[PDB]
Amino acid sequence: GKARAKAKTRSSRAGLQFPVGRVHRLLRKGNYSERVGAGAPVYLAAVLEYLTAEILEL
DNA sequence: ACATGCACAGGATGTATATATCTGACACGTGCCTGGAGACTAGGGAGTAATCCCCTTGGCGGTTAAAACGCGGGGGACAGCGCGTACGTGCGTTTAAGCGGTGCTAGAGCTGTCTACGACCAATTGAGCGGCCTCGGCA
Helix, strand or coil, X not given: CCCCCCCCCHHHHHCCXXXXXXXXXXXXXXXXXXXXXXXXXXXHHHXXXXXXXXXXXX
């Protein structure tokens, strides 16, 4: 068989706009820890997205 | 006589040999964008002289904290309970990993504008005349 066409993003499943997959990509390749949680980048993206929303509104 | 320092046992720690490969130092192509200098331009700045007004100064003077000092409460020092922390332990859930699939998010493009960037004009708020008036005043 083959992998899923138009498979839904971690971001849009969370309702976020920031790239949660890239947050996981960068947490892992950024060497911050040898293993990284699946909801860790959701939480981090949501905080960066919140700070981004607040600072841009002001 | 106390905190620091002595050698043994234990148990794992750093180690040496090994299989497998991808990280990274290198020559070369690459070809950018930086280093360079000059022509051109006039906005900005250098140096001097004017003089206002500010920080420094010496001071008067008060009143403040340091200074000397004692009362009594509470900080500093051991036994006694019990509650938390460090593991022991097996379970099982968590992410990692292979490398495809293929989505959209990327560099770089080109697009047409088209916000907002200069530059000009028409507002509202400032101290100095002008004539009036009264209060305060002299002879």
